[PDB]
Amino acid sequence: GDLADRFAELERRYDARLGVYVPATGTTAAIEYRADERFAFCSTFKAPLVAAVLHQNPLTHLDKLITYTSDDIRSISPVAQQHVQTGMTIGQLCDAAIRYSDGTAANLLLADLGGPGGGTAAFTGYLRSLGDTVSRLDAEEPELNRDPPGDERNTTTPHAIALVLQQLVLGNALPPDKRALLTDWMARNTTGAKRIRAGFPADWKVIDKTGTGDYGRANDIAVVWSPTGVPYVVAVMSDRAGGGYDAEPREALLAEAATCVAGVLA
């Protein structure tokens, strides 16, 4: 048969555009579907953002206390809005940014990278350093989730983001100790149970970072491990450009796409 047909059938059924990339491995071919089309990052950028902060600092930096006010809560911040009085360490912010997709935490981590545009230029530079000539981040939370479909700002490609995550989690872009921190935060993500996780059998490990936004945007990037401990990177991205800015994102589309991918990999 042809996996591409079955992805196209998902697009028809969900009235959505779907993007998939699984890098080839020692024993498997790549899986690609619209893998070089652009899709908005949404909150999926927070995994490589945490990697950028890790990369650029000794681990003692994770204890640096960042202070902020209620006026800094400008996006959905489940953790940060309950710590305005005490503030949050860079480590706590990393934790929140990944595991709770904390917007304010992401904005504070961007500010930590520093430079023009509140850290957005710095973030894009980190991606360039990892060989990503495609992806760009141009806005903070929450604006980065809400560009129209035709806007290249704040976009990546399944192919590009997959190769970034491969390096970070399974490669040598980070030293082992920084890598383990990123891996753990993603492994204990709380937002992802209905996406790639829901497409893989329960004896597979899944670590992930979700993203959600306007025009029906639903993304998930994961690293999965087979029951024998063989790893693969899975990037799935979707949107519904024809359904209006308020089109409903479809978690089940990512879960079904992931099921298709598990069938190939198992």
Ligand X SMILES: *C(=O)/C=C/N[C@@H](C(=O)O)C(C)(C)S(=O)O
| Number of other CB atoms surrounding residue 111 within 10 Å | 16
Of 47-55, 86-94, 206-214, 237-245, which part binds ligand X (CB under 6 A)? 206-214
- How does DSSP classify residue 17? E
Pattern of binders to ligand X over 149-188, x per CB under 6 A? ----------------------------------------
Q: Which of 32, 75, 77, 141 is catalytic?
A: 141
Residue 145 engages ligand X in binding (rule: CB under 6 A): yes
| Minimum distance of ligand X from residue 152's CB (angstroms) | 18
Residues annotated within the binding site for substrate are 101, 210-212
Closest CA to 215 of 245, 237, 238, 236: 245
Q: Is 141 a catalytic residue?
A: yes
C-alpha dihedral, 242 to 245 to 249 to 254, nearest 10°: 50
Of 87-95, 113-121, 209-217, 233-241, which part binds ligand X (CB under 6 A)? 209-217
Q: What is the DSSP string of 170-237?
A: ISSSS-HHHHHHHHHHHHT-SS-TTTHHHHS-TTSEEEEEEEEETTTEEEEEEEEE-TT--EEEEEEE
Q: Which of 32, 43, 135, 238 is catalytic?
A: 43
Which residues of this chain interact with ligand X, rule CB under 6 A? 42-43, 75-76, 101, 142, 145-146, 211-214
